[PDB]
Symmetry: none
Subunit: 215 residues, 2 copies
């Protein structure tokens, strides 16, 4: 399916510079650079698989809008798919990581603000997350010498709600191991609870407190 | 002089280890940081960046001896080929109240400069397809001017003058003084 096809496609496919018209190459570092770098690398793959399955892939005009990519069949435009790309680092392999997942006051509460199509028109909300391990000019022959800002990069594709948390970072994600984002191990029980919790966030400061309140 | 050496951009894709180029306002800061340091260290200035985002300025510069003679720098970016502005800071924080959202008390700063970028909004590739990749921007011009000399009288945050890039590099805004500008932008 578009999804299985997409995660395996992502799992397959190490950027190390910015190349100029005159051939010169400039190294990156961590200084919103790596995030934009991982979003760029993502465009092609997304285009490739959507197309293979007949999906239109839209990006937003007024940039600050959710979502990074909206995918839908023309036969079914009420079933749009939303893909947001998130990036995080980690200073130690196998140590808990977390992401930010955007606004909880815009579209989630207004259905139309800061989102491309109205919120109701999207059936699923996927997050593609990059977890990179934290680590003058050059010619095309120096590629292996140009110092990279990381020593590895992992990626998962998952549902926004399944990995959302109960605290602002903008919503934060759960504070867990890469493994738990892949495996889908979160705190919310359903998407409804995830959205009830975030549409009503001002009574409650965390999940436990949220549930006593709903009782 | 800092401003001197300081005062004295055709990227076309991101490159991979294996050669693949991926066609494309952060590259502009990217180009910025290394140069700020070089000229700053050439003069013994400590360059510092914000620990929290949404904080002023992008770069603070001061020699460790004196910290009441700092310099604040902000990289701005904007786009149009030969047409009619920037968004500078906010008029209610650190400016109206000396310590809100600025890395250091506003009064530690004897200068606020703006390095600005201006261009015209004009599949993977390989090294040989280099000069065939489609640039998304043309005509990058850049200027280094004082924040107050540039500032306008209208908010979007304080607005700059909406003029042509030369008015920027020469300093032809509308307030007659730094003191006039600050009074006005409360």
């Amino acid at each position: 399916s578009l999804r299985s096809d997409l995660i395996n496609a992502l799992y397959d496919e190490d950027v190390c510079g910015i190349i100029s018209a005159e051939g010169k190459i400039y190294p990156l570092g961590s200084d919103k650079v790596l995030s934009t770098i991982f979003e760029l690398f993502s465009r092609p793959i997304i285009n490739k698989i959507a197309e293979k399955h007949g999906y239109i892939v839209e990006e937003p005009k007024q940039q600050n809008h959710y979502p990074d990519f909206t995918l839908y069949k023309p036969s079914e435009p009420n079933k749009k798919i939303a893909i947001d790309i998130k990036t995080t680092y980690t200073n130690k392999e196998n140590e808990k990581i977390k992401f930010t997942l955007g606004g909880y006051t815009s579209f989630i509460r207004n259905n139309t603000k800061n989102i491309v199509y109205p919120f109701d028109q999207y059936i699923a909300h996927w997050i593609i997350g990059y977890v990179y391990t934290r680590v003058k000019t050059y010619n095309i022959n120096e590629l292996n010498e140009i110092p990279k800002p990381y020593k590895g990069v992992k990626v998962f594709l998952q549902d926004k709600w399944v990995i959302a948390g109960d605290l602002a970072g903008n919503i934060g994600s759960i504070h867990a191991h890469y493994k738990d984002f892949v495996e889908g191990k979160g705190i919310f029980d359903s998407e409804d609870e995830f959205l009830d919790y975030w549409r009503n966030y001002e009574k409650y400061n965390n999940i436990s407190e949220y549930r006593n309140w709903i009782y």
